[PDB]
């Protein structure tokens, strides 16, 4: 009697509570990712309310493994949850298979939960889109996970709030050919000058994966040589 | 050590029958393997006013067996306002048995009582549950002693078939001289005996005291 | 409280399910997958939804999957809901050989799905899978077959159906231009006619459908398509018909 | 059915999904047993209305033992579930008790299961039914203690008659059974109070393809379903011809 | 590992070419023969053939587990099992069940493929136990009679024609010298662009 | 104060604080028929007026027995009262077959009433609508009642529910119950509250009201119909 | 024991067996039993050893069959009902013994008259001729001195009334009566004889 | 423990002894080794005491609630397998029985004999017991499948005296039972067979 | 939902769960089967769109044993688990009695499992009505026919499906005892009275007999359907 879906269908043929969780994305932080020729960017402002919290203690970029990065956008409670799954997958993955688990079978296992609980009598679906990226020995990866279930094989966009304007700059600021280094530059200027904001410094954290380097998040410091320019 | 839980406490139990009686004498002596715990523990309960048990195997399994049978026997007399017959009574302690066919109760049981207006009925059975229909019987263990006793007066081997008359008067003496002669040859027989003769009337708690060797 | 219980599996006063027929026409507003079987072999249509150009569009396509090396279905409805049922019809592919030491043929395939459908709608108190494919395969019984199941789950075999969206103008071209017996190369040809004239153009656009075809050599090799390769088909297209 | 639940009491103190569904007991054949001092007389009607029926494999008069026989009214398809559990309790009672089942005690299980929703023990967790059984019950028999007959309700209240009637025609054969039924009365008195109790309310004739009543004697204790010849023989007295 | 239904199997590593060997003996009893046709090695993928040997009861029973896994595996990554997964899948599919274990003595021989190509042969035992060895390497009733046999005829790195040679001569004077094996041999010698499946004339005996 | 809203659940709780779902099933009982139990000196008598459904209906049973010297009498649903009195019975049974000792009534009455109680908390339970008369003598004479929630009382006269507001008053003037030690004037006390609480125009006991009597040396004896009809109903 | 004799030619399978019901081993309870368990699909099985294990496992094996080819509108494949029997044994190795020795044979139109062999455990393996039990040690070799390639089966029944009289003359118990399963262009029938 | 089974030109003739024993000593002489079931199927204890005996009235149990579901008479063929499926279950748990079923089906005289771990063998001349293999000799020389009923019953006295003549385990009372076209008729007990003797001195 | 009442009283005394899945039987293919003395010829109608679905992978006409045909109307999807699980129990008792099931047996299970839908927690009624023809103990044919509340009963000739009271009461006019084999399947394809519709491909026939069931060619189905338009005017 406590278990009947309450993501039911609609006379108009969607799931309403699906649309609800979409609008909980489209107003929480930006969150972008961008693939390149040698590596993957994943960046991601980090809305500073005040000065106390540690900058160090919170993360929009956790590690997946020693070459998967994850990036979410949402409700940062449904995040950890879904972390924890992620990283107990990436085991059990590599508990029978002695390799590295791949971003094609990660994502498919998460795909497979996050829809679960758009089926599953008593729950609620998913309040975030992740967006996973890697370095894979079938070349480098970039996915997103929509809440409803569904994955899209991107190569470069952003999942947060004015996910339709700033998505603009990668249609065209972008080739099918670009470095490492050059992703850094214009994965900024999606977060400066497409936002009022404020002068954007020490509020920006970028995942790299520098040509099959295990995954390297960026400091403090270390993102000031991209931000001066 | 692997703790056999199978003692036998000695003790037995005889049957008799004839027209509109039955009785079931049993000695009272509880006893380990070879020492003597006590001289008196009744080994016939009984369960209504015309049928009794008794048994003889090891205490453990006959107050358990007793009281299990009281309490299915107690729920049956309201739950159908009738006391039962002996004839259903055997019946409902032939499953109780099976019920625990794997870990056997070891006590083999007697059942004895009366159903019509005479019909002396009697049932015995070994320690799982084959209940037959007999006219005389002892078990426990002067099981083989006494039932060779019993099986000349009852059943008979002689040419002339005589003892044509069998009254109450005179079977009881005999019961009382069966046991006796279990006393006398076997060693866990006991020296308290409770002799119960169910008539058409109730049942009868005689009592009697063999030798305490 | 029950006063939450939006009864997904409760009959209506006609008779039908609502939650059926909810989903059914669910699944009418997603893409269109085009099936049809010829002579050489069956081929499978499909219409990537566009969402934007920054897919990569060269790699792999979210509609035509792959259930073993004989069968393979194309998607036609909520995305999300299918992955969960293709992964369920892998484990019923590979759960055949692993117990009969030999191939499923796709006619039972079928039922082992369908019957993963029709459950939801039966017990359970949970929505319904808002997604039918258009499964086909080659077996060693009966040649190439094409089945589309639904979301209650009456399946039905075929030779040639166009589910997903617009289905009305895109039967009424293969109910008049497929033939009894056709080869491959002109098979392939019916099932991108059919296509363009579902989306209301005149030709593909290139960065638009996929397609993918079994024909049997007798290894079942079951060769998909590239993004180069369709421009050969859409060359041939625009010649003659 | 709007949001109240199945366990939900009325402020008269009732329950809503008992109420609701004894209505549904005056929808089938009619029905009538009558128990005297010499045996029980069951009977019923045989509505055979489609002529492509077999009219053999519908019958409104079951049977749970040698014993005890009995009726059915309300849902068919329901009483065909208490009937298959009471076929297989009185029969499992025929293994633990060698003696035959007591009407008063068959009737009782059978009362039990009426009542799936607020029980906490065994033997009835495997399938706990949801719905309260729209059925009601004309359990006879000759177990002991002379000839018994029962009435079950799906409320639970399972009364003794001396004469009861169930089905459509439950309160139009009240009035006559009240009124002609005798304290003293033999088998042939009580088979021609079954007919004409029988005539009275009814549609159609009392032919021999229209009733289908069965008896159990006090002698053999033994249920025998009346063929085609007894039933023949007792429609043609025709003790109290009225209209 | 049994007496009953004797077998073995070896694997060799040439220089860019593999290959692997086994009997074809199906036997009843310990000895007994009632087939001659038990082919001991299975085509798992394209490029990566496994050898199991022990009892029959575990080789077509993990064989078939493997081929559910494997195939499984393929079309969720929609490209084929390499080596090094599938051998760490061995060895936990092996230990998975260790209180109720499956008598084989499995062997794996198959292209690392790092459009390079590597030998990477190796065994394991009856609970699991991984064994990487980048030269020969032999499993089976005939471990005994197959170690030192093999020590002595191994060259470092050798072509296509001379490794056929190298372990049909190493098998054959092997079986002839066991009594519950060795009723034919079937080597299954591999390179990247082609396999070549050579019966031998063995012993009958 | 609302009959619509807190009203379709054991769950809900009123806004004035009571609990209208179990107030329900306590009304429950005032719908079936009267019964009432006197407690002497050493004796406890309990009467129980049956009900007929027709003329040609036998009264149905209301007074049960559950041991040798524990009896009940239901008053309200009969099919939840198979429930109680088949665990009550269970449980003076299950006493005799662990100890040897007889059951505490005190001990017996608080298991049946924790029954009461776990079908009030969860929300797919409803509570037992029935009230239970429970009369016995275990080492002193004792009578109690139960509640659809869970209470014990320790009552020396009752009634309940069919013409209570009669019978009641009867009781509350009459103390000499107790110093009345012959069985015979306790019975017609006893029989005198169900005359007193009839309904008019009715039959007064024409061998249709149960009466069984538990004391010092009498188990749950039935009185049978050619004792009570004889004298002990015709004395008025 | 009980010979389970199975002969595979090029376009036929002959399977012989025994009809000696052993209970109570001094004697021998009922002659012409019932080893074969005929599955609709032409696919003769034939088991062999304790009576108890053979009904429990032909009876279960045959109707699970029997639902597959009655679930779909086609008959099962030898190869498929080779390897699903091979499955039950191993499944119902680890909680029953099931001593059991099958002789599985049948046809497919797409690989010819099969014969398989199994044994205690599960040892499925595709032969042209096989025996089981303890009367195999005598049966095995006749059957490889005549297995003259192409063979037919006025040839096959001479081989086995070759290799009956064997079991007559140089065994331990021996048997004479006999139980064949000829299974010519799709017509099986039994031909039981004797000596 | 000796048992006999016939399948006569007219019905099944059952014979028992009645003797059982608990090693080296008689336990009693009165048991009935004839159980039936049916009012044409009547089942055959042996072997175990009580082993079989509940199963036999387990079988009862089963067999009357078919007889009521599908009001139709159950075959014998029916109530062996059911009773063996139900005695393979106890296989590995210690029991030992021997039972021979047999009754009148709606085709023909059938009779099966079921053993412990389910080994229901259909026949015609089936016996099981202690002293088998005497009275399953005896029967060699004189069934003709073609003899009445009046020499059909002394071959079933003649079969079991000399089985419990040979035998220790089985003996006592003998019981011979007749299965009819619409029940069983019965024979009660004969006790002691004097079919070589003239009371000179003992046999050999 | 889980384990709740789908199937409840309402407030007059009818089942409206399973009026409702009584009724969709009414939206469904129709079908019609009629008994004889020693065989049983079905029906059931079909449509599909032409030019595709040739074999109509056996919608209707379903065979459960050697000898045990059935035919159902209403919820096709539905017929996926109720055949299965009527199969099933048809191996069960051939594995537990030893005996073929009689269609006594069957069309009580079937009548048992849909019972049992439409009184457990948490289900949905099935809304299939099917017809039985089999085989009895001995040789006996019974045309059985199950509605979805759970009540069957032996019949004569029935048809159920779209609008089954028109096309039964034709049937309850001409229909004769025993009726020869060429005889009786011209009124079971006599049953077109429903489906406005005279083409051969969209009814289908079978005939059960010999405990093996045979169907009806496309040849001899049009020369019975020359004779129903000629027997109109």
Same mark, same amino acid.
């Given at each position: ?229 | ?213 | ?241 | ?243 | ?205 | ?236 | ?75 099962? /494949? ?5 390897? $699903? ?5 191993? =499944?119902? @190795? &680890? ?68 290799? /009956? ?5 140089? $065994? ?5 009566? =006999?139980? @064949? &399963? ?14 | ?204 | ?233």
């Amino acid at each position: 009697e406590y278990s009947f879906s309450l993501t039911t269908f609609s006379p108009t043929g969607k799931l309403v509570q699906i649309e609800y969780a979409l609008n909980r994305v489209s107003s929480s932080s930006p969150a972008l990712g961008i693939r390149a020729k040698n590596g993957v960017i994943i960046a991601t402002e980090k809305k500073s309310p005040n000065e106390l919290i540690e900058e160090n203690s919170i993360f929009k970029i956790q590690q997946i493994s020693e070459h998967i990065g994850i990036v979410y956008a949402g409700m940062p409670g449904d995040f950890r949850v879904l972390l924890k799954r992620a990283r107990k997958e990436a085991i059990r993955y590599s508990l029978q298979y002695g390799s590295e688990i791949l971003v094609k079978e990660l994502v498919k296992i998460i795909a497979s939960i996050v829809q679960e609980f758009t089926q599953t009598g008593g729950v609620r679906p998913f309040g975030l889109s992740l967006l996973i990226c890697g370095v894979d020995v079938y070349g480098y990866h970039l996915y997103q996970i929509d809440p409803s279930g569904c994955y899209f094989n991107w190569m470069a966009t952003c999942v947060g709030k004015d996910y339709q304007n700033n998505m603009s700059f990668l249609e065209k600021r972008y080739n099918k050919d670009i470095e490492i280094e050059d992703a850094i530059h214009t994965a900024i200027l999606t977060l400066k000058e497409s936002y009022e904001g404020v002068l954007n410094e020490k509020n920006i954290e970028i995942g790299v994966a520098y040509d099959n380097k295990p995954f390297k998040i960026l400091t403090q410091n270390e993102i000031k040589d991209y931000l001066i320019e | 050590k692997r703790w056999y839980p199978y003692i036998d406490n000695g003790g037995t139990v005889i049957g008799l029958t004839g027209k509109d009686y039955v009785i079931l004498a049993a000695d009272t002596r509880l006893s380990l393997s070879y020492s003597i715990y006590t001289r008196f523990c009744p080994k016939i309960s009984k369960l209504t006013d015309k049928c009794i048990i008794g048994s003889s195997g090891m205490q453990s399994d006959i107050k358990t067996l007793h009281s299990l049978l009281q309490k299915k026997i107690q729920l049956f007399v309201l739950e159908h306002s009738h006391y039962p017959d002996i004839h259903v009574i055997a019946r409902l302690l032939c499953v109780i048995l099976y019920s625990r066919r794997f870990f056997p109760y070891y006590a083999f049981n007697i059942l004895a009582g009366v159903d019509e207006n005479n019909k002396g009925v009697l049932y015995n059975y070994d320690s799982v549950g084959s209940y037959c229909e007999a006219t005389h019987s002892c078990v426990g263990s002067g099981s083989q002693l006494i039932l060779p006793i019993l099986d000349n007066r009852v059943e008979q081997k002689n040419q002339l078939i005589k003892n044509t008359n069998f009254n109450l008067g005179d079977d009881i003496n005999f019961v009382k001289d069966a046991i006796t002669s279990a006393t006398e040859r076997d060693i866990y027989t006991g020296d308290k005996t409770l002799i119960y003769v169910i008539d058409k009337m109730g049942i009868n708690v005689n009592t009697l005291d063999l030798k305490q060797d | 409280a029950r006063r939450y219980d939006s009864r997904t599996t409760t009959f209506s006063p006609e008779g039908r399910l609502y939650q059926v027929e909810y989903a059914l026409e669910a699944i009418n507003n997603a893409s269109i997958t085009i099936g049809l079987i010829t002579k050489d072999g069956v081929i499978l249509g499909a219409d990537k939804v566009f969402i934007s150009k920054l897919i990569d569009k060269a790699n792999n396509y979210e509609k035509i999957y792959k259930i073993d090396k004989h069968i393979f279905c194309g998607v036609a409805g909520l995305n999300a809901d299918a992955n969960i049922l293709i992964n369920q019809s892998r484990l019923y592919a590979q759960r055949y050989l692993y117990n009969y030491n030999e191939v499923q043929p796709v006619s039972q395939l079928v039922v082992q799905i369908c019957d993963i459908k029709q459950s939801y709608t039966q017990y359970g108190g949970l929505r319904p899978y808002g997604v039918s494919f258009l499964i086909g395969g080659y077996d060693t019984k009966d040649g190439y077959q094409l089945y589309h199941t639904d979301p209650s789950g009456n399946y039905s075999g075929w030779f040639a159906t166009a589910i997903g969206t617009n289905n009305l103008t895109a039967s009424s071209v293969l109910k008049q231009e497929w033939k009894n017996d056709m080869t491959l190369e002109e098979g392939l040809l019916l099932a991108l006619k059919t296509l363009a004239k579902s989306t209301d153009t005149e030709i593909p656009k290139s960065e638009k459908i996929e397609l993918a075809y079994l024909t049997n050599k007798d290894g079942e090799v079951y060769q998909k398509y590239l993004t180069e390769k369709e421009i050969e088909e859409l060359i041939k297209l625009y010649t003659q018909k | 059915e709007y949001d109240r639940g199945v366990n939900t009491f009325s402020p008269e103190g009732r329950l809503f999904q008992v109420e609701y569904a004894l209505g549904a007991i005056k929808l089938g054949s009619t029905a009538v047993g009558i128990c005297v001092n010499d045996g029980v007389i069951l009977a019923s009607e045989r509505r055979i209305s489609s002529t492509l029926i077999e009219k053999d494999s519908v019958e409104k008069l079951l049977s749970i033992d040698d014993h005890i026989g009995c009726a059915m009214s309300g849902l068919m398809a329901d009483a065909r579930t208490l009937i298959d559990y009471a076929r297989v309790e009185c029969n499992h009672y025929k293994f633990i008790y060698n003696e035959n089942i007591n009407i008063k005690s068959c009737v009782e299980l059978i009362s039990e299961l009426a009542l799936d929703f607020s029980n906490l023990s065994d033997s009835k967790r495997k399938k706990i039914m949801s719905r309260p059984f729209g059925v009601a019950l004309l359990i006879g028999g000759v177990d002991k203690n002379g000839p018994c007959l029962w009435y079950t309700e799906p409320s639970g209240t399972n009364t003794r008659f001396s004469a009861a009637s169930i089905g459509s025609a439950q309160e139009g054969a009240e009035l006559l059974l009240q009124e002609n039924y005798k304290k003293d009365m033999t088998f042939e008195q009580a088979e021609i109070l079954a007919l004409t109790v029988l005539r009275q309310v009814m549609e159609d004739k009392l032919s021999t393809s229209n009733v289908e009543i069965c008896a159990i004697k006090k002698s053999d204790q033994t249920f025998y379903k009346y063929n085609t010849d007894d039933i023949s023989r007792i429609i043609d007295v025709l003790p109290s011809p009225v209209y | 590992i049994y007496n009953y239904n004797g077998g073995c199997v070896l694997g060799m590593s040439g220089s860019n070419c593999v290959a692997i060997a086994c009997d074809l003996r199906l036997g009843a009893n310990t000895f007994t023969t009632v087939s001659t046709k038990f082919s001991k090695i299975f085509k798992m993928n394209n490029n990566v053939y496994v050898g199991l040997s022990g009892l029959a009861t575990d080789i077509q029973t993990l064989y078939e587990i493997l081929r559910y896994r494997v195939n499984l595996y393929e079309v969720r990554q929609d490209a084929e099992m390499d080596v090094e997964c599938f051998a760490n899948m061995l060895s936990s599919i092996l230990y998975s069940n260790r209180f109720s274990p499956y008598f084989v003595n499995p062997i794996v021989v198959g292209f690392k493929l790092k459009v390079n190509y590597e030998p990477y042969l190796t065994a394991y035992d009856l609970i699991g136990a991984k064994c990487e060895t980048r030269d020969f390497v032999v499993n089976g009733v005939t471990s005994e009679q197959l170690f030192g046999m093999c020590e002595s005829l191994y060259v470092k790195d050798q072509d296509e024609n001379g490794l056929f040679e190298t372990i049909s001569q190493c098998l054959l004077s092997a079986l002839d010298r066991d009594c519950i094996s060795g009723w034919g041999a079937e080597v299954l010698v591999l390179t990247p662009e082609k396999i070549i499946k050579k019966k031998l004339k063995a012993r009958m005996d | 104060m609302y009959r619509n809203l807190y009203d379709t659940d054991n769950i809900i709780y009123s806004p004035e604080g009571r609990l209208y779902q179990v107030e329900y099933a306590s009304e429950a009982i005032k719908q079936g028929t009267c019964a009432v139990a006197i407690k002497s000196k050493d004796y406890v008598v309990v009467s129980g007026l049956k009900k007929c459904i027709s003329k040609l209906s036998f009264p149905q049973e209301k007074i049960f027995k559950i041991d040798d010297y524990i009896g009940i009498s239901m008053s309200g649903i009969t099919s939840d009262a198979k429930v109680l009195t088949k665990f009550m019975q269970n449980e003076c049974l299950s006493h005799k077959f662990l100890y040897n000792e007889n059951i505490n009534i005190e001990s017996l009455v608080r298991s049946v009433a924790d029954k009461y109680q776990k079908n009030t908390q969860k929300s797919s339970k409803r509570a037992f609508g029935v009230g239970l008369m429970i009369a016995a003598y275990h080492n002193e004479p004792c009578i109690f009642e139960t509640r659809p929630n869970g209470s014990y009382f320790e009552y020396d006269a009752l009634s309940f529910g069919a013409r209570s507001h009669a019978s009641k008053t009867y009781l509350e003037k009459n103390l000499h119950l107790f110093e009345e030690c012959s069985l015979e004037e306790l019975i017609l006390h006893c029989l005198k509250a169900l005359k007193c609480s009839l309904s008019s125009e009715s039959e007064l006991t024409i061998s249709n009201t149960a009466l069984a009597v538990v004391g010092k040396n009498h188990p749950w004896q039935e009185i049978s119909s050619l004792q009570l009809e004889e004298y002990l109903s015709k004395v008025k | 024991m009980d010979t389970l004799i199975g002969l595979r030619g090029n376009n036929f399978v002959v399977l012989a067996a025994d009809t000696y019901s052993i209970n109570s081993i001094i004697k021998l309870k009922n002659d012409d039993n019932t080893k074969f368990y005929d599955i609709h699909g032409n696919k003769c099985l034939l088991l062999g050893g304790s009576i108890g294990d053979r009904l429990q496992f032909g009876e279960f094996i045959r109707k699970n069959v029997h639902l597959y080819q009655y679930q779909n509108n086609t008959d099962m /494949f030898v190869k498929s009902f080779a390897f $699903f029997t091979r499955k039950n044994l191993a =499944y119902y @190795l &680890r909680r029953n013994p099931f001593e059991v020795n099958c002789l599985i044979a049948g046809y497919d139109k797409k690989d010819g008259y099969q014969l398989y062999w199994c044994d205690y455990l599960s040892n499925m393996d595709s032969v042209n001729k096989g025996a089981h039990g303890y009367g195999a040690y005598l049966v095995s070799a006749i059957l490889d001195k005549y297995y003259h390639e192409n063979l037919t089966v006025d040839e096959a029944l001479d081989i086995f009334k070759l290799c /009956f009289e064997e079991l007559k003359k140089r $065994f331990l118990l021996t048997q004479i009566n =006999y139980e @064949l &399963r000829i299974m010519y262009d799709n017509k099986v029938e039994t031909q039981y004889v004797t000596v | 423990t000796t048992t006999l089974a016939f399948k006569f030109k007219d019905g099944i003739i059952v014979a028992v002894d009645s003797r059982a024993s608990m090693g080296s000593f008689i336990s009693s002489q009165n048991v009935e080794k004839i159980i039936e079931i049916n009012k044409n199927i009547l089942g055959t204890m042996a072997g175990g005491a009580a082993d079989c005996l509940y199963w036999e009235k387990y079988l009862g149990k089963i067999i009357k609630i078919y007889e009521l579901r599908n009001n139709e008479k159950i075959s014998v063929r029916a109530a062996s397998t059911i009773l063996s499926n139900i005695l393979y279950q106890y296989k590995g748990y210690g029991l030992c029985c021997g039972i021979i079923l047999s009754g009148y089906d709606h085709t023909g005289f059938n009779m099966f004999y079921v053993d412990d771990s389910g080994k229901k063998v259909e026949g015609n001349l089936f016996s099981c017991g202690s002293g088998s293999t005497y009275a399953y000799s005896i029967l060699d020389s004189a069934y003709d499948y073609n003899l009445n009923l009046d020499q059909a019953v002394e071959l079933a006295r003649n079969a079991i005296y000399h089985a419990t003549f040979r035998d220790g385990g089985s003996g006592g009372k003998v019981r011979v039972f007749h299965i009819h076209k619409n029940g069983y008729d019965k024979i009660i007990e004969g006790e002691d067979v004097f079919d070589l003797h003239y009371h000179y001195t003992n046999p050999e | 939902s889980y384990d709740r009442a789908i199937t409840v009283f309402s407030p007059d005394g009818h089942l409206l769960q399973v009026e409702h899945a009584l009724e969709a039987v009414k939206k469904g293919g129709c079908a019609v089967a009629i008994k004889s003395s020693n065989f049983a010829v079905l029906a059931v109608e079909k449509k599909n769109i032409p030019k595709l679905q040739n074999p109509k992978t056996t919608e209707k006409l379903i065979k459960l044993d050697e000898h045990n045909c059935l035919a159902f109307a209403g919820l096709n999807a539905d017929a996926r688990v109720l055949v299965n699980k009527t199969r099933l129990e048809c191996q069960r008792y051939y594995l537990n009695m030893d005996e073929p099931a009689p269609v006594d047996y069957i069309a009580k299970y079937v009548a048992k499992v849909q019972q049992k839908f439409t009184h457990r927690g948490g289900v949905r009624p099935f809304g299939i009505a099917t017809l039985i023809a089999g085989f009895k103990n001995n040789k006996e044919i019974c045309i059985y026919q199950t509605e979805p509340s759970g009540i069957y009963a032996a019949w004569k000739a029935q048809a159920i499906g779209k609008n089954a009271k028109i096309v039964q009461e034709f049937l309850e006019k001409n229909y004769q005892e025993n009726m020869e084999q060429k005889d009786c399947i011209f009124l079971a394809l006599k049953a077109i009275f429903e489906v406005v519709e005279l083409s051969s491909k969209n009814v289908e026939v079978a005939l059960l007999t010999e405990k093996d069931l045979t169907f009806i060619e496309e040849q001899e189905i049009n020369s019975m359907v020359e004779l129903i338009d000629q027997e109109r005017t």
